[PDB]
Design an enzyme around this catalytic site. Structure first.
Site, mmCIF file in Angstrom:
data_model
loop_
_atom_site.group_PDB
_atom_site.id
_atom_site.type_symbol
_atom_site.label_atom_id
_atom_site.label_comp_id
_atom_site.label_asym_id
_atom_site.label_seq_id
_atom_site.Cartn_x
_atom_site.Cartn_y
_atom_site.Cartn_z
ATOM 1 N N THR A 1 33.364 -43.702 -35.747
ATOM 2 C CA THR A 1 33.991 -43.312 -37.007
ATOM 3 C C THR A 1 35.385 -43.912 -37.139
ATOM 4 O O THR A 1 35.754 -44.412 -38.210
ATOM 5 C CB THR A 1 34.049 -41.788 -37.111
ATOM 6 O OG1 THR A 1 32.720 -41.252 -37.062
ATOM 7 C CG2 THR A 1 34.708 -41.366 -38.415
ATOM 8 N N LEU B 1 -27.162 -53.991 -22.095
ATOM 9 C CA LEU B 1 -27.411 -53.112 -23.232
ATOM 10 C C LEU B 1 -26.457 -53.380 -24.388
ATOM 11 O O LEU B 1 -26.897 -53.636 -25.512
ATOM 12 C CB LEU B 1 -27.303 -51.649 -22.792
ATOM 13 C CG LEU B 1 -28.385 -51.163 -21.829
ATOM 14 C CD1 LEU B 1 -28.318 -49.661 -21.667
ATOM 15 C CD2 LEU B 1 -29.757 -51.590 -22.310
ATOM 16 N N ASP C 1 -21.938 -54.426 -25.317
ATOM 17 C CA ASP C 1 -20.686 -54.786 -24.802
ATOM 18 C C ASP C 1 -19.712 -53.797 -25.315
ATOM 19 O O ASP C 1 -19.317 -53.896 -26.412
ATOM 20 C CB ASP C 1 -20.293 -56.112 -25.362
ATOM 21 C CG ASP C 1 -20.769 -57.243 -24.534
ATOM 22 O OD1 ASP C 1 -20.576 -57.201 -23.316
ATOM 23 O OD2 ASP C 1 -21.321 -58.200 -25.090
ATOM 24 N N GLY D 1 -15.816 -52.767 -21.193
ATOM 25 C CA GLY D 1 -16.829 -52.982 -20.202
ATOM 26 C C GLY D 1 -18.047 -53.630 -20.742
ATOM 27 O O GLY D 1 -17.952 -54.398 -21.615
ATOM 28 N N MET E 1 -23.482 -43.364 -17.744
ATOM 29 C CA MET E 1 -23.876 -42.514 -18.855
ATOM 30 C C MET E 1 -25.395 -42.408 -18.919
ATOM 31 O O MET E 1 -26.123 -43.211 -18.335
ATOM 32 C CB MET E 1 -23.347 -43.057 -20.186
ATOM 33 C CG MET E 1 -21.875 -42.814 -20.439
ATOM 34 S SD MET E 1 -20.833 -43.868 -19.425
ATOM 35 C CE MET E 1 -21.059 -45.435 -20.257
ATOM 36 N N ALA F 1 -29.700 -43.944 -23.932
ATOM 37 C CA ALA F 1 -30.228 -43.681 -25.263
ATOM 38 C C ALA F 1 -31.651 -44.215 -25.343
ATOM 39 O O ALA F 1 -31.887 -45.405 -25.115
ATOM 40 C CB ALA F 1 -29.346 -44.328 -26.325
ATOM 41 N N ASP G 1 -12.839 -45.859 -32.893
ATOM 42 C CA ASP G 1 -13.838 -46.818 -33.411
ATOM 43 C C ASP G 1 -15.188 -46.284 -33.643
ATOM 44 O O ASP G 1 -15.894 -46.241 -32.774
ATOM 45 C CB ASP G 1 -13.953 -48.110 -32.624
ATOM 46 C CG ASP G 1 -14.454 -47.931 -31.242
ATOM 47 O OD1 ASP G 1 -14.488 -46.829 -30.737
ATOM 48 O OD2 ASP G 1 -14.766 -48.938 -30.610
HETATM 49 C C1 LIG Z 1 -33.322 -51.250 -27.155
HETATM 50 C C2 LIG Z 1 -32.806 -50.738 -25.861
HETATM 51 C C3 LIG Z 1 -31.328 -50.624 -25.904
HETATM 52 N N1 LIG Z 1 -30.818 -49.415 -25.347
HETATM 53 C C4 LIG Z 1 -29.448 -49.198 -25.569
HETATM 54 C C5 LIG Z 1 -28.855 -48.259 -24.897
HETATM 55 C C6 LIG Z 1 -27.541 -48.071 -25.128
HETATM 56 C C7 LIG Z 1 -26.845 -47.000 -24.364
HETATM 57 N N2 LIG Z 1 -27.520 -46.240 -23.850
HETATM 58 N N3 LIG Z 1 -26.654 -45.457 -23.280
HETATM 59 C C8 LIG Z 1 -25.337 -45.870 -23.527
HETATM 60 C C9 LIG Z 1 -24.132 -45.441 -23.193
HETATM 61 C C10 LIG Z 1 -23.107 -46.116 -23.635
HETATM 62 C C11 LIG Z 1 -23.261 -47.199 -24.396
HETATM 63 O O1 LIG Z 1 -22.100 -47.856 -24.818
HETATM 64 C C12 LIG Z 1 -22.098 -48.596 -25.950
HETATM 65 C C13 LIG Z 1 -22.149 -47.880 -27.272
HETATM 66 C C14 LIG Z 1 -20.992 -49.570 -25.712
HETATM 67 C C15 LIG Z 1 -22.379 -50.070 -25.934
HETATM 68 C C16 LIG Z 1 -24.490 -47.603 -24.710
HETATM 69 C C17 LIG Z 1 -25.535 -46.972 -24.301
HETATM 70 N N4 LIG Z 1 -26.917 -48.868 -26.042
HETATM 71 C C18 LIG Z 1 -27.660 -49.783 -26.648
HETATM 72 N N5 LIG Z 1 -28.885 -49.918 -26.396
HETATM 73 C C19 LIG Z 1 -31.629 -48.488 -24.616
HETATM 74 C C20 LIG Z 1 -32.986 -49.060 -24.440
HETATM 75 C C21 LIG Z 1 -34.022 -48.076 -23.988
HETATM 76 O O2 LIG Z 1 -33.403 -49.584 -25.589
HETATM 77 N N1 LIG Z 2 43.499 -44.831 -27.085
HETATM 78 C C1 LIG Z 2 42.453 -45.184 -27.868
HETATM 79 N N2 LIG Z 2 41.643 -44.206 -28.351
HETATM 80 C C2 LIG Z 2 40.584 -44.505 -29.139
HETATM 81 C C3 LIG Z 2 40.326 -45.914 -29.466
HETATM 82 N N3 LIG Z 2 39.233 -45.934 -30.250
HETATM 83 C C4 LIG Z 2 38.825 -44.650 -30.413
HETATM 84 N N4 LIG Z 2 39.629 -43.797 -29.749
HETATM 85 C C5 LIG Z 2 39.479 -42.322 -29.710
HETATM 86 O O1 LIG Z 2 38.111 -41.960 -29.915
HETATM 87 C C6 LIG Z 2 38.007 -40.872 -30.837
HETATM 88 C C7 LIG Z 2 36.869 -41.139 -31.813
HETATM 89 O O2 LIG Z 2 35.665 -40.544 -31.341
HETATM 90 P P1 LIG Z 2 34.251 -40.960 -31.989
HETATM 91 O O3 LIG Z 2 33.689 -42.180 -31.299
HETATM 92 O O4 LIG Z 2 34.402 -41.209 -33.470
HETATM 93 O O5 LIG Z 2 33.316 -39.677 -31.721
HETATM 94 P P2 LIG Z 2 31.750 -39.723 -32.087
HETATM 95 O O6 LIG Z 2 31.563 -40.438 -33.403
HETATM 96 O O7 LIG Z 2 31.209 -38.317 -32.182
HETATM 97 O O8 LIG Z 2 31.007 -40.463 -31.002
HETATM 98 C C8 LIG Z 2 39.342 -40.757 -31.556
HETATM 99 O O9 LIG Z 2 39.826 -39.413 -31.484
HETATM 100 C C9 LIG Z 2 40.289 -41.689 -30.830
HETATM 101 O O10 LIG Z 2 41.386 -40.952 -30.287
HETATM 102 C C10 LIG Z 2 41.253 -46.923 -28.903
HETATM 103 O O11 LIG Z 2 41.098 -48.141 -29.137
HETATM 104 N N5 LIG Z 2 42.263 -46.490 -28.137
#
Ligand SMILES: C[C@@H]1CN(c2cc(-c3n[nH]c4ccc(OC5(C)CC5)cc34)ncn2)C[C@H](C)O1
Ligand SMILES: Nc1nc2c(ncn2[C@@H]2O[C@H](COP(=O)(O)OP(=O)(O)O)[C@@H](O)[C@H]2O)c(=O)[nH]1
Length: 858
Positions: A13, A397, A399, A403, A458, A461, A505
């Site tokens: 200030t 299965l 992506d 993983g 897991m 499905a 997602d």
């Molecule tokens: C057609 C074929 C494909 N299949 C699946 C299985 C899955 C599935 N299962 N469990 C999951 C657990 C996690 C997961 O994480 C995803 C959503 C990131 C791919 C997938 C699967 N996801 C697609 N396809 C199962 C077989 C029988 O059928």
């Molecule tokens: N001696 C000296 N004192 C200073 C100087 N600059 C600032 N001050 C002191 O700092 C004080 C200001 O505090 P301030 O920074 O505004 O407080 P804050 O805003 O709450 O952080 C004043 O009371 C001054 O006496 C300087 O160059 N010389």
């Protein structure tokens, strides 16, 4: 024009000539003289922006962390008493309108009364000192336009200047008000803890108390060090808020512990064997800042070491990038429990934990049980001998984000194994947040988790992912099945969102189908928690999600968003479910334009892809694809909208022109009106009392009946013939039942009683009837109310909220029987699926069966 900022410790200030409680502004250049006191530090990371020149007074550092966090490039100048440049020491029209603000408190809801322009014009003005419009989805205050920003800076930290550091709401109130309490919490100034108390993390006790926590020996405690060069600006307010909102759910996942606060640190204790002392430490001859975490070295004390570690590691991934390395993690250990602790880097100890879980000159399970996942439930630990896993392209299965799901067999069962490709333990443990500690019939179930190959196991499905169903086999997506896919996914989001987890997602590739049987209890599950993170209350900031399957506020990474980003993602998933492949197929054929229109210029599903119209779902899609995240219904409401049999069975809702007022109609697919015409395929705008050719109340079920005056004849609005005789007179809220054999009344049906049970609005006057062979009866009341009653037991459901007065009801043939209903509102020709009485019971049973399953898993 351009604004300057003077930042530094107490000693600003006075320098401004060419005790600072606030960020008072005296524009010349626009100065933003900050407060050097450590109490105000937690609240003004927000006010540092790119378009500013920074001045520092070190006098004769945490400041530059957020300087190079909002903008890497900034003209920073240093004076005395990472862009150092000196050591001298010692939309234009709206600006004028916004300058004049004659109000009591300088906040205006909307500029429309005062006055792509607005949303962009305000941002440039917000980048200057004219006004502050935060407009972040998480803050939920985008409807407030803070003019005279010096007001907001001044009276927002006056709570901490007017035991040591706790204040009740009433005291603040006793000194247009509910918004003030929202501003206090959303800026990490005064967060609620009780029903009437505000914690105020800043200005708490400066020195920690004397704690004689029960376990003092080296063999009874686990200590985790988080050495940093310095505490980032407002770090402890973020950490204290995170730890007191997960405290009831840290051991069980609802046990409220006893809590202590001293503005750097927190002590949570459930028992002498289950406690946690997170707190800052100061080591002698070390110009660093530590974060000690002390927990008992028992089973119940290791569980919440991996909870605190997960919630501190995540709290720097989303809120303090840059520390991830500046921050190094130690692990205190000692062989004989009489000597001083020794520290080994957590990364170095991770290398020794990848080959054998022993440390030689004691087990790693007591030094750091979270690197070997020794704190997650013992039943999900991988037994590597019972794993028949190959990792071949023939067994691939999908992506995942980090993983690749491979097929494998574990314990004889045929399961899916995810292999993390180049990655870290954090990715495995970040996904473990959801896989365990959260069990639901609509979330993929974890069977085992290994650490030596770093895989997740897991369940498989049975029928694959929804993406393959949409793109390959479109014939099996029945309307009663693709509703259950959306219902199950919406139920999964509801559980994740209620458990502090934002999924990030949601795409058809991540929706796993375990069956195509429409009436099964479990049909769809959501997999892949690669990007799921905690959305505590402060929202999320880091932006992830596949382009074309994410909310508009996620594509623009400048804002901080909330769990409503998953509702927009669900709106696109339900948009794809309704349109089958549709947009996705076009999306892969037009890269860099899939996310261009998400924006959000999605065309009408029926107009482009030519799907069968699905009202009350197109409406649901429209209100889920809202640019404003607050206008999107929450995941608890999206499920409630989907959990209704009127949504499933409503097929057509043709709206007739204004004041047409049709009173008669007959079927033939086209529908006749009276004389008008209407074609169902193109929606282009008594008949054949009369019967098709008797001329009049005529019905038959070859025994034919009739009705005239107040008597029944065979060889009064409608006559219904069944095993019994159903009939009602003009303006008769009660329907009398007769028997043909006895010609005597056999009871009456009163629609007013049925309407009264459900909580001159309710007309109840019967205007028409229609009967169905499934022992269900349709009654058309005088309002927009439809009553479904069993013919045998004499209620199924009351259909409402679709018109104002039902006029005529009848059944036609669309290859599907439909109960098309004409009613006034303007008049509409509503068409219902004839299986509506069945689907009310089937969906009611389906929810109850899944509700029992949800309790069963927990
Ligand atoms: C057609 C074929 C494909 N299949 C699946 C299985 C899955 C599935 N299962 N469990 C999951 C657990 C996690 C997961 O994480 C995803 C959503 C990131 C791919 C997938 C699967 N996801 C697609 N396809 C199962 C077989 C029988 O059928
Ligand atoms: N001696 C000296 N004192 C200073 C100087 N600059 C600032 N001050 C002191 O700092 C004080 C200001 O505090 P301030 O920074 O505004 O407080 P804050 O805003 O709450 O952080 C004043 O009371 C001054 O006496 C300087 O160059 N010389």
């Amino acid at each position: 024009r351009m604004k300057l900022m003077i930042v530094g410790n107490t000693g600003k200030t006075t320098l401004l000539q060419q005790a600072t409680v606030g960020i008072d502004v005296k524009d010349w250049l626009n100065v933003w003289d900050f407060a050097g006191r450590e109490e105000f530090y937690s609240t003004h990371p927000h006010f540092m922006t790119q378009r500013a020149l920074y001045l520092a007074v070190y006098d004769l550092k945490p400041w530059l962390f957020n300087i190079k966090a909002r903008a890497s490039s900034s003209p920073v100048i240093l004076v005395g008493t990472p862009a150092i440049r000196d050591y001298h020491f010692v939309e234009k029209i709206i600006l004028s309108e916004r300058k004049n603000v004659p109000i009591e408190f300088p906040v205006i809801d909307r500029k429309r009364l005062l006055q792509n322009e607005l949303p962009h014009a305000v941002h440039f003005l917000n980048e200057s000192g004219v006004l502050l419009h935060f407009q972040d989805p998480a803050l939920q205050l985008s409807d407030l336009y803070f003019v005279e920003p010096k007001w907001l800076c001044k009276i927002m930290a006056q709570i901490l200047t007017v035991p040591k550091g706790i204040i009740s709401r009433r005291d603040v109130e006793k000194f247009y008000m509910s918004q003030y309490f929202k501003l206090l919490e959303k800026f990490q100034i005064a967060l609620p803890i009780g029903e009437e108390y505000l914690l105020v993390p800043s200005s708490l006790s400066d020195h920690r108390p004397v704690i004689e926590l029960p376990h003092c020996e080296n063999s009874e405690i686990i200590i985790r060090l988080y050495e940093m060069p310095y505490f980032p600006m407002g770090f402890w307010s973020r950490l204290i808020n995170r730890l007191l909102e997960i405290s009831p759910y840290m051991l069980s996942g609802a046990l409220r512990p006893n809590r202590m606060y001293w503005r750097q640190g927190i002590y949570l204790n459930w028992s002498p064997e289950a406690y946690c002392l997170v707190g800052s430490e100061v080591l002698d001859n070390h110009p660093e800042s530590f974060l000690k975490i002390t927990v008992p070295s028992c089973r119940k004390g290791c569980i919440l070491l991996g909870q605190v570690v997960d919630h501190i590691d995540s709290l720097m991934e989303e809120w303090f990038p840059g520390l991830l390395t500046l921050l190094k993690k130690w692990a205190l250990y000692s062989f004989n429990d009489g000597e001083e602790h020794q520290k080994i880097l957590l990364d170095d100890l991770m290398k020794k934990a990848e080959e054998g879980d022993l440390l030689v000159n004691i087990p790693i399970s007591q030094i750091a049980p979270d690197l070997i996942l020794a704190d997650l439930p013992r039943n999900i630990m991988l037994n590597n001998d019972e794993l028949e896993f190959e990792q071949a392209p023939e067994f691939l299965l999908g992506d995942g984000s980090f993983g690749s799901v491979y097929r494998a067999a574990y314990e004889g069962e045929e399961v899916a194994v995810k292999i993390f490709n180049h990655t870290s333990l954090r990715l495995l443990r970040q996904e473990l947040v959801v896989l365990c500690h959260l069990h639901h019939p609509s979330l993929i179930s974890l069977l085992a988790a290994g650490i030596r190959p770093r895989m997740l196991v897991m369940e498989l499905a049975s029928k694959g992912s929804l993406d393959r169903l949409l793109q390959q086999d479109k014939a099996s997506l029945t309307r009663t099945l693709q509703h259950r896919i959306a219902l199950h996914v919406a139920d999964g989001l509801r559980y994740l969102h209620s458990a502090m987890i934002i999924y990030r997602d949601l795409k058809p590739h991540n929706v796993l189908l375990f069956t195509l049987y429409p009436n099964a209890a479990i049909i769809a599950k959501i997999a892949d928690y690669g990007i799921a993170q905690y959305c505590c209350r402060m929202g999320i900031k880091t932006s992830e999600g596949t382009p074309g399957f994410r909310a508009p506020e996620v594509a623009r990474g400048n804002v901080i968003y909330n769990q409503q980003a998953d509702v927009y993602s669900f709106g696109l998933l339900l948009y794809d479910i309704l349109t089958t492949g549709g947009r996705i197929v076009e999306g892969l054929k037009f890269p860099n334009e899939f996310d261009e229109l998400e924006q959000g210029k999605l065309p009408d599903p029926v107009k482009e892809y030519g799907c069968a119209p699905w009202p009350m779902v197109e409406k649901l899609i429209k209100q889920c694809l809202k640019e404003n995240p607050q206008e999107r219904p929450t995941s608890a409401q999206v499920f409630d909208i989907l959990n209704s049999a009127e949504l499933v069975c409503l097929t057509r809702r043709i709206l007739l022109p204004k004041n047409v007022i049709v009173e008669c109609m007959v079927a033939t697919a086209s529908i006749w009106l009276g004389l008008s015409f209407l074609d169902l395929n193109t929606e282009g705008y008594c008949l054949a009392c009369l019967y098709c050719l008797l001329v009049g109340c005529l019905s038959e079920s070859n025994v034919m009946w009739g009705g005239c005056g107040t008597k029944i004849f065979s060889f009064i609005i409608t006559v219904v013939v069944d095993t019994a005789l159903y009939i009602a007179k003009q303006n008769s809220p009660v329907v009398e039942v007769w028997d043909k054999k006895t010609e005597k009344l056999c009871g009456l049906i009163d629609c007013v009683h049925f309407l009264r049970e459900v909580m001159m609005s309710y007309s109840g006057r019967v205007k028409t009837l229609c009967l169905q062979k499934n022992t269900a009866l349709w009654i058309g009341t005088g309002g927009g109310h439809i009553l479904l009653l069993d013919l045998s037991t004499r209620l199924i459901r009351v259909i409402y909220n679709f018109c104002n007065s039902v006029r005529v009801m009848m059944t036609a043939q669309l290859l599907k029987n439909v109960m098309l209903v004409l009613g006034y509102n303007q008049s509409c020709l509503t068409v219902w699926d004839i299986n509506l009485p069945h689907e009310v019971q089937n969906l009611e049973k389906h929810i109850e069966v899944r509700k029992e399953l949800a309790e069963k898993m927990r």
